[PDB]
Structure 1
C-alpha cells in the first residue's frame, strides 16, 4: 500500500558538523529514511538519516551542508528509504548523479519504485554464469574470457586508455535483447562527452542509460550513483529479461567519497583510511550481477578503476580483487609502446573462464592454449629480466625463443585496432601460430591429444 500519512517538516536543526545536520524532537526517526532540506534562500537539498537516537536524527546531506542554518532550515522527512522511480523508458536517456534527468527530457514515470539498496540475491536461486561474451578483444576473449553475467573490473594506471577500452566493449561485446547501464563517478567533462559521443558513434545510444556524476558535482552523490545504476539494471534484467551490461566508471572516484564520509563520521579506518566496511560497501555494489532462476536477464558488471600511484595492492583494487570474478589489467609498459589496448594478460585472470570455454562454448583447444600462452608469456618476462642483467650471451637458444615469444605475442595477440573485432577462433589461431615458435613437446601445459589435433596446422 502507498504511504498515506501526511509528511512532517522540522525546523529543529540542532547542530551541523561536516556533511551532517542533526535534528532534534523528531517523532519516531527511521534509520536510512530520506529527508529533503530547504535552505533559508529556498534552495532544495536531500539527505539520508545516518543515525537515530530517541528524538535525534543525524542526517547526511547529499548536496553539501554549506548554507544550512540552525533556525530557518526546513527538513521534510519523506517517511521512507531512498526509492528510485524505474522504467524501461530510462533506456536512451541521461541522468545526473542522483538520477534527476539532464537530457532535457521529462521526469521518469515510474513503472515501479525500487529500493536503491537492492536485495541480497538468494545463493540458491543464483545461476553460475557460463555463456561466453566475445568482447572482440583478443586479450579478453582469448585469455581472460567474460561470461554473460560476470562481474570483472578493468584496473588501470591513471591516464591509460581505459575509457577507449570500455567504449570498444560497448561497441563489440556480444554472445557466441542486449542493453547497457552506464554510470560514471567524479568523471571530468572532457570524458563525459567522450562516453556520450561514443554511444552515438557506435549507434548504441537508444539501448543505453548514462548516470553521470562529474568531479565538480557533490561527492556524497557518488555513493548513490552506482546504486541507482544497479537498481535500474535489476529492473531491466530481473524484471524485464534484458541482457544488461553495467559499466561503473572510476570506482576510485567513488571510493574517495567513501573515504571522505568515513573521515567525516570518524569511522574505524582500514588500510589508507577507507572505512572498515569498505569491503561490504564494494560488495553491495559488485554482488548485483549474474543470472537468477526463471529470469532470462543477466547483469554483467565491468567496473573501471584508476589504481592510485599504479599500486595493485592499494585498497581500492585489492578489495575489488577479493570480490570480482578476476580482473583485467591495463599497463603503461604496453601503452608507452603504443600497444593498444594496453591489456597485460599476465596479472589478469577471469574466475569464470574455467566453465565459459571448451566444447559447446568455444573450440576444444581454448583452455589449453590459454594456459600455455600464460606459461610462455611469463617465462618470456623472466628471461627478459635475466637479459636486462646478464645479456643475451647468458641466455640459451630456448630462453631467446621465450624472449622472442614475448615480443611476437605483444605485437600480434594483444595489439589490436580500436575498432577491430576479432573472433575467439581468430584469437586462438593467432595463439597457435605463436605457440608453433616452440617445438610441439615444449608446450608442457598442453595434453598430447590437443597437440595432435591443433599444433601442426
Structure 2
C-alpha cells in the first residue's frame, strides 16, 4: 500500500557526521567536550579510544559549547590527545522486526546467538510517548495461572502489572518459570514472551535458557541478558529495550505479550550508583530523589488500547534487601503498580511450595474479572471468608504461645485446624500440577466445611444455602 511505501521513502537519504578530536577533561564516568557546533540533548556518540576500540555514550548537559557525555562501557583508557568522538545526530534507537522472536540479545541489544543482524523493518526510540489516557480500556479478563493461591485468593487480568516480592534465596525464579509455562485464558498458551534479565549470575541465565528450551517455548520468545559482570551503566537501557520491543509487537502486530523483568533491585542500585556519580539531592536511604518518576516511566507501559487487540502484561520480579516491606523500592513499586504477590520466607522453611502467604498480597483488578459469566458466583466472597479465617488463625496461634492452651475457645480450635489444613493441602502444590479455577474453588469450599453455617458471616446466606449443603 502507498502509506507503507512512503513511511520509509525518507530512509533513502545520506547525512554525514562530524568528528571532534577535542576533549577537555574526564572525571568519573563523564567526559567533557568543547566547540561542539550546536549540540543536541540526549544524543548518541561513538568514542574511539586510542587502542582502536569503539565505545558509546550519551550527552546529559549542554552549555554554550560544552557537552557532558557519560560512557556506558566504563571510561578507563581514555586520552585527551588521540580519542575521537562522532555525533550521530539522533537519540538512541533500536532496530525492531517481528523476526526477533526466537533470538538472544545482550544488554545493548545486539545478537549473541551466533546469528546475523536484525535486518529491521523500522527503527524505534527506546523511550516512548505516554499513552493518551482517553485511549485506554481496563481489562475485564482473567488468566488461569494454575496456582491456587494466585488464581483463587488473588487474580490476574491480562493487561495488568503485578510484581513478585521475594527475599534472596527463595525460588521466585521457579515460580516465574511455572507461571510463564502454565498460563492461559480461562474458558490459549499463545503468549509471546519477552524476557529481560539485568544483574544476574551465569547460573540464573543458564537455568532460564534451559527451561524455555525444553518446554517448546523458545520459538516464540526474545531474551535480553545483562549478567553481573557486564558494565553497570548499560543496566539502565535494557528494560527500555525490552519494553520497546514488547510495545512494537503488541500494539502493531496484534498479539498478546507477557513481559518479565528479572531483578528490579539491580536496576535501582544502578540508578543510585549513577546518581551518586553526579550530585543529585538524595531521597531516604540515599536513593535518588526522582526515582519514583523513573520507575513510573517503566511500569506504566502495560494495558490495552481502544483500536488494537494486543495487550502486554508485566511480572517484574523484585528483591527486598532485608525482608523489609518499608524499604523505598517495594514502597514505590507497590504505589505505582496495582497489586503484588508476596513470597514468604517463613513458609519456605517448612518446605511449602509455592511459599506464598496471602495476607500481605493484593490484586486490584480482581473485583472486575471475577463474578458471573466467567466463574461461579461464590468466588467474590469465598476469598473474603478465607481471608478472615486465615487472619483469625494467625492471631489464635499467636495467643496459644502466651497464655498456653486454656483460654482457647472452640472458635480458636477450629481456627487452628483450618490454618493447618489451609497450608498443608490448599496452598501447597506440585511444580507441574495444573488447577482449573473450578477445582480450586471446590477445594476451598471443602475447607469451609469445618465451620458451621451459623458463623460464616462474611459470606452471603444465599450462597451458603445453595453450596454449603451439596
TM category (shorter chain) comes to: over 0.9
1:37 paired with 2:47, answer: yes
Match in the other structure for 1:167:
177
Contact (CA 8 Å) 1:328, 1:349: kept in 2 or not? Answer: yes
1:185 paired with 2:198, answer: yes
Match in the other structure for 2:57:
47
Distance in structure 2 (CA, Å) of the matches to 1:14 and 1:130: 58
RMSD: 1.2
1:278 paired with 2:291, answer: yes
Out of 75, 90, 113, the residue aligned to residue 80 of structure 1 is: 90
1:132 paired with 2:142, answer: yes
Distance in structure 2 (CA, Å) of the matches to 1:453 and 1:14: 81
Measured after TM superposition, the shift of residue 393 of structure 1 is 2.1
1:151 paired with 2:195, answer: no
* Correspondences of 1:373-392 after superposition (within 5 Å): 373-392=386-405
Q: TM-score when scaled to structure 2?
A: 0.95
Deviations 1:196-234 (A, max 9, x none): 101012211111111110111111111111111100000
Secondary structure at 1:45 match in 2? coil
Match in the other structure for 1:222:
235
Match in the other structure for 1:298:
311
Q: Classify 1:414/1:40 alpha carbon distance in 2 versus 1 (closer, same or farther; 3 Å).
A: same
Tell which deviates more after alignment, 225-234 or 69-78: 69-78
Q: Which is greater in Rg?
A: 2
Match in the other structure for 1:406:
419
Secondary structure at 1:190 match in 2? helix
Distance in structure 2 (CA, Å) of the matches to 1:387 and 1:219: 50
Name segments (4+ residues, structure 1) moved above 4 Å: none
Match in the other structure for 2:4:
none
Structure with more strand by fraction: 1
Contact (CA 8 Å) 1:392, 1:400: kept in 2 or not? Answer: no
Measured after TM superposition, the shift of residue 4 of structure 1 is 3.9
* Correspondences of 1:202-221 after superposition (within 5 Å): 202-221=215-234
Out of 111, 115, 119, the residue aligned to residue 125 of structure 2 is: 115
Match in the other structure for 2:327:
314
Match in the other structure for 2:67:
57
Distance in structure 1 (CA, Å) of the matches to 2:371 and 2:413: 32
Match in the other structure for 2:251:
238
Unaligned runs of 5+ in 1: none
Measured after TM superposition, the shift of residue 174 of structure 1 is 0.9
Deviations 1:23-49 (A, max 9, x none): 121121111111121111111111111
Q: TM-score when scaled to structure 1?
A: 0.98
Distance in structure 2 (CA, Å) of the matches to 1:182 and 1:128: 24
- The count of aligned residue pairs is 457
